[PDB]
Structures are given as C-alpha cells and as structure tokens.
Amino acid sequence: MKPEDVIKEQCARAKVVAELWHGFTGGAPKAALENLVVEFNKAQQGRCVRPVPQGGYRDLSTKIKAAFAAGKVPTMAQAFENNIALYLEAKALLPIESLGVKLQGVNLTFLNAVRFGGVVYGVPFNKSIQVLYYNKDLLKKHGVPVPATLEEFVAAAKKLSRAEGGPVYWFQPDASTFAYFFFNLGGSYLKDGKLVLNSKEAVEALTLLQNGVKEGWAKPITSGAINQNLGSGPYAFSVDTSAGYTYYLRAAKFDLGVATLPGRTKGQPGYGLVQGTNLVVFRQASKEEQAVAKDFLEFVLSPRAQAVFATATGYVPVTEGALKDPVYQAYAAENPDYATIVRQSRYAKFEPALAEWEQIRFDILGQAIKEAILNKADPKAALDRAQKLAEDLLSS
Ligand SMILES: Nc1nc2c(ncn2[C@@H]2O[C@H](COP(=O)(O)O[C@H]3[C@@H](O)[C@H](n4ccc(=O)[nH]c4=O)O[C@@H]3CO)[C@H]3CC(O)(O)C[C@H]32)c(=O)[nH]1
Numbered sequence: 001m002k003p004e005d006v007i008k009e010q011c012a013r014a015k016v017v018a019e020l021w022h023g024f025t026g027g028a029p030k031a032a033l034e035n036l037v038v039e040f041n042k043a044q045q046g047r048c049v050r051p052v053p054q055g056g057y058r059d060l061s062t063k064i065k066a067a068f069a070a071g072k073v074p075t076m077a078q079a080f081e082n083n084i085a086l087y088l089e090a091k092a093l094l095p096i097e098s099l100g101v102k103l104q105g106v107n108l109t110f111l112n113a114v115r116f117g118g119v120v121y122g123v124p125f126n127k128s129i130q131v132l133y134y135n136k137d138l139l140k141k142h143g144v145p146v147p148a149t150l151e152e153f154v155a156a157a158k159k160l161s162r163a164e165g166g167p168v169y170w171f172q173p174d175a176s177t178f179a180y181f182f183f184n185l186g187g188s189y190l191k192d193g194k195l196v197l198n199s200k201e202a203v204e205a206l207t208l209l210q211n212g213v214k215e216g217w218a219k220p221i222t223s224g225a226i227n228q229n230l231g232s233g234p235y236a237f238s239v240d241t242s243a244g245y246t247y248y249l250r251a252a253k254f255d256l257g258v259a260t261l262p263g264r265t266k267g268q269p270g271y272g273l274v275q276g277t278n279l280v281v282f283r284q285a286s287k288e289e290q291a292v293a294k295d296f297l298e299f300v301l302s303p304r305a306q307a308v309f310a311t312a313t314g315y316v317p318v319t320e321g322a323l324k325d326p327v328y329q330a331y332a333a334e335n336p337d338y339a340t341i342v343r344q345s346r347y348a349k350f351e352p353a354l355a356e357w358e359q360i361r362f363d364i365l366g367q368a369i370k371e372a373i374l375n376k377a378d379p380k381a382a383l384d385r386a387q388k389l390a391e392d393l394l395s396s
Contacts, residue, residue, distance in 0.1 A: 003034035007041060007050060015046035018075035018285065018292035021064065023057035023277070028246035029126065032312035040299050047292050049076075057277070061086075061358060068092060075285040075293050078277035081113050081350060082357035084121050087280065089355055094281040096120040099294040105320040106301065109348045114278050116353075122278030123297045124318040126309070128243040129345045130180055130272035132262065133226075136255040138164070138236050146259045150184060150270070153237070153262040154208075157217040160236045167219035168236030169212060170226045173373035175351070175361040176273055180239045181205035183349045184263060184270040190352060197365055197390055198383035206372050206379040213373060220373050227251045241275050242341045245314025258337040260344045271349040276315055303328075311338060316345040356393050364389045 011017045020037070024030040033051060041048045052074065054060040061083050067073045068090060079087065087093050096103065097120055103111060110124035134146065139156075142163050147153040157169040171177045185208075187201030196202075212218025221229050226238045227247040235254070239261065248256055260269035279300065281293045299305055306322030309315060311331040322328055323342065332338045351357060368386035371377035 003031065003038050004051070006038050007034060007048070010038070010041040011048045011050045013046075014041075014044070014048040016286075016288040016292055017048050017050050018289045018296065020049050020051045020279070020296075021054045021060060021067075021074045021077040022051055023054060023060040023078050025053065025056060027250075028313050029243060029315075032309050033126075035312070036300065036305055036309060039305075040296055043299075044292075044295075047288075047295075049292060049296050058358070058362065071284075073282040073284045075289040076279050076281055076296070078125065079122055079280045080275075080277060080358065081122075081353035082355060084114065084116065084278065084280060085353050085357075086355040088116055088121060092282055092284070093121045094283050094285070094290065096123055096281070096297070099281060099290060099297070101294055101297045101301070103301075107316075107318055107320070107345070109274070109345065110278075110318050113274065113350055113353070122280050123300060125279045125300055126243070126276040126313070126315045127274060127278075127318055127345075128241040128276040128314070129274060129316055129341065129348055130176070130239050130261060131242050131341060131344050132257075132259040133238045133240055133244070133248055134257040134259060135168075135234075135236050135252075136257040138168070138234065138254065139257070144236075146257070147237075147262050148260075148266050148269075150181075150262050150264065154212075154217070157212065157236065158215065160234070161217040164234035164236075166233045167213070167217050168234050169218045170221055170229065170235055170238045171209065171218060172226065173209070173220050173222075173369045175365045175369065176241075176275065177209070177239060178202075178205055178365070178369050179273040179349070179351065180261065180270070181208055183273070184261070186264075195352060195354065195360070195390055195394065196387065197360075197368070198380065198387040202383050203380050206369060206383060209369075210372050210376070210379055222374065242314040242316060242344070243276055245337065245341070246312075258340045260340060261347070263347075269344060269347045271347050272344050274348045274350050307331075314341060316341060354394075356390075359393065360390050364393070 054063040114122035182205040263270035303321040303325040307325035307328035310317040368382040
C-alpha cells in the first residue's frame with residue numbers, strides 16, 4: 001500500500017485540502033515528497049496537502065499556465081526561478097513572508113534566488129547541485145586520480161577512453177551540461193543586462209564538448225538519463241544533478257563515486273548548476289488553503305524534514321539547521337557523498353531568472369547544443385542562430 005493511497009485517504013476525511021502540483025515522475029524524489037506529506041497530514045485535524053503529479057517540470061509549468069487560463073490554480077506548486085518570474089507577470093504569487101513563514105537560516109544561495117524586487121516569492125524545497133559522478137573501479141584499474149581541474153578532467157577522459165576503447169565521459173547535449181563548462185570557462189549569460197548565448201566562452205564550451213566527441217573521449221547520451229544508459233560500454237564520469245544520486249546508485253554495476261566538480265585550478269571546485277525547485281503559494285488559494293500552505297512550508301523548512309528529504313534523494317539541505325540534525329549527521333557519518341554534495345553546494349551558479357528562460361533553455365540554446373553535438377553544426381554558427389532566436393523571442 002503506497003503513500004499516494006494513504007494521502008488520498010487523508011484528504012478524503014479532510015475539511016480543507018491544499019493541492020501541491022509537482023514534477024516528480026517517480027523514484028526517491030516522488031517517494032520522499034509523498035513520505036513528507038503523509039507525516040505532515042497525520043499532525044493535522046481536517047487539514048491536508050494533496051500532491052498531484054503533473055509529469056516533468058516542463059509539463060508542470062504548461063499545466064500551471066492552463067490552470068491560470070481555466071481559473072483553477074492549486075495552493076502550491078514547484079517552480080524554477082524563471083517560472084516564478086513568469087507567474088509574477090500575472091501577479092499570481094503570494095509573498096512568503098506575508099504568510100508568516102520564517103526564512104532565517106535558509107541558505108542565502110537559495111534565498112537570494114527566490115527574492116524578486118527584495119520580496120521572497122518561493123520557499124527553496126528540492127535544490128540540487130551538479131556533482132561529478134564517477135566509476136571508482138575504472139579510475140583505480142588505470143591508476144587515475146579523481147580529476148580536480150578541467151585540464152585533469154580532459155586528460156583523464158582521454159587516457160581512460162584510449163585504455164577502454166570508447167568514450168568514458170558521458171553527457172547529455174543539453175543547457176545543463178553546457179552550463180557547467182560555460183561557467184567554468186569564465187562565461188556569464190547576462191552582459192550589461194542583455195542575454196548573450198553566443199559569447200566567446202559559450203563558443204569555447206560548446207567547442208570543447210564537440211571536440212571531445214570527435215576525439216573519442218566524450219559520449220553523447222541521446223535517449224534517456226545518463227543513469228538509464230549505464231551498462232552499455234565503459235563509463236568513467238558524468239556531470240549531473242545531485243538528485244540523480246539514487247538513480248545512479250540503483251543502476252551502477254560498478255562502485256559509484258561522487259566528487260566535487262573539476263575547477264579552473266585546485267584552489268576551488270568548479271561551479272555547479274543549481275537545479276530543482278522552490279515551492280510557491282498562489283494568491284487564488286483560499287485563506288484556509290493558505291494557512292495549510294503556511295504550516296506545510298514551516299514543516300518543509302524544519303531540520304528533520306530537510307534531513308530526511310535530502311538524505312533520501314541527494315538534494316541539498318536548504319537550511320543551516322538541517323546539517324545540525326542527528327538524522328542528517330548519522331547518514332553523513334555513514335556516507336561521505338552527502339558531505340560531498342553539501343561542499344559542492346557552496347560553489348553554485350544559477351541560469352538567468354527571465355520569464356522566457358524555460359523556452360530558451362530547451363527550444364533555443366538546447367537545440368543549438370544538439371545541432372553542434374549531434375549534427376556537427378559549427379559551434380559559433382549554432383550559437384549565433386540561438387542568440388538571434390532568443391533576441392526575437394525577448395522582443396515579441
Ligand atoms: N522545466 C524546467 N526544467 C529545468 C529548468 N532548469 C533546469 N531544468 C531541468 O531540471 C532538471 C534537474 O532537476 P533536478 O530536480 O535536480 O533533478 C530531477 C531529475 O533530473 C532527476 N532524475 C530523474 C529521473 C532519472 O532517471 N534520473 C534523474 O536524475 O531527479 C530529479 C526529479 O526528477 C534537469 C533535467 C532535464 O530534464 O534535462 C532538464 C533540467 C527550468 O527552468 N525549467
């Protein structure tokens with residue numbers, strides 16, 4: 001008997017039901033969310049949260065847009081920073097601090113990301129950071145240290161690919177993988193407030209991936225998650241969301257490693273991309289639904305909920321107090337990867353928080369990356385096209 005059943009039963013008896021629309025399709029993220037809600041719902045009398053799976057994150061924001069057009073929004077939903085920006089155009093979001101939710105002790109990396117015109121409009125919930133996944137067995141077999149620099153990373157991917165007879169750095173040709181190389185070659189998306197997809201660091205980053213494919217050390221993954229492709233050919237490394245941790249653990253037929261990202265120098269790990277979502281509260285919710293949202297958001301920010309959620313998933317605990325919780329401490333003491341994920345969370349960069357950014361990242365930038373990697377499009381030409389399509393979108 002599944003948590004979503006327990007929850008359906010809880011909400012059946014409840015006087016007030018606050019819907020939480022989410023983008024978790026399964027595995028540990030879905031189960032840890034459902035587990036959190038079952039615990040919250042047991043402490044209420046006649047008050048519940050009902051989680052509603054809307055598919056993936058793209059499906060979720062499409063369904064929220066349709067909810068506005070139909071005039072029936074949930075109480076809460078997951079949202080990226082750029083989704084928050086879009087919902088704020090429609091004035092659709094309640095300021096978090098007005099609900100009475102205390103945000104002292106939320107990591108400033110995550111809080112700064114939800115603050116628009118000095119006003120917090122989201123509660124960091126499931127915040128991920130990119131990490132280096134690696135094959136501990138394969139690096140040991142060839143006496144290869146974990147690479148700490150981009151230079152060591154490329155040298156390691158070449159050495160191991162030559163040794164195993166195939167490309168060992170696995171990557172999706174997408175905006176997220178691109179962000180890692182872009183950021184760590186000195187790139188920035190905003191130049192004097194204008195969005196720039198075709199800067200020389202963008203050309204450099206997309207060139208490095210395309211050269212990695214041509215040179216036989218980088219393997220493009222075109223069908224499924226990297227962790228869904230494991231077992232076909234030699235794997236040494238990938239740069240991927242911390243929220244992949246349970247997926248990689250379940251799939252890997254090798255000893256899985258987690259490290260901090262290779263940086264420009266050993267002075268500091270490389271910057272990871274922050275992904276995952278914040279919880280927003282819709283103004284259209286009733287006072288009674290908003291009160292359930294307030295208690296639910298206080299629960300989600302509690303040290304125990306954060307300790308359980310983050311240790312179940314590989315998401316980053318969003319509060320100072322979660323790291324001081326004995327349940328977090330017990331898992332960390334048993335598993336050095338949790339500390340590795342927290343350490344990487346200190347070296348964190350975000351994509352632009354523009355309303356149009358969801359469209360741009362997948363349909364424009366993402367497509368330019370695929371053109372370059374999959375169809376050998378010239379990197380500059382592919383990014384010049386992306387820039388123009390972005391400029392026309394931002395004009396329209
Ligand atoms: N809609 C929209 N999406 C965005 C935006 N910025 C980034 N992203 C996407 O965030 C995903 C990272 O979010 P995260 O919560 O860290 O991790 C996800 C999953 O990625 C990961 N997962 C799921 C199944 C699996 O087999 N393996 C696995 O790792 O588990 C989590 C819950 O599904 C990336 C993934 C992407 O689909 O390629 C597109 C990326 C945006 O602005 N909008």
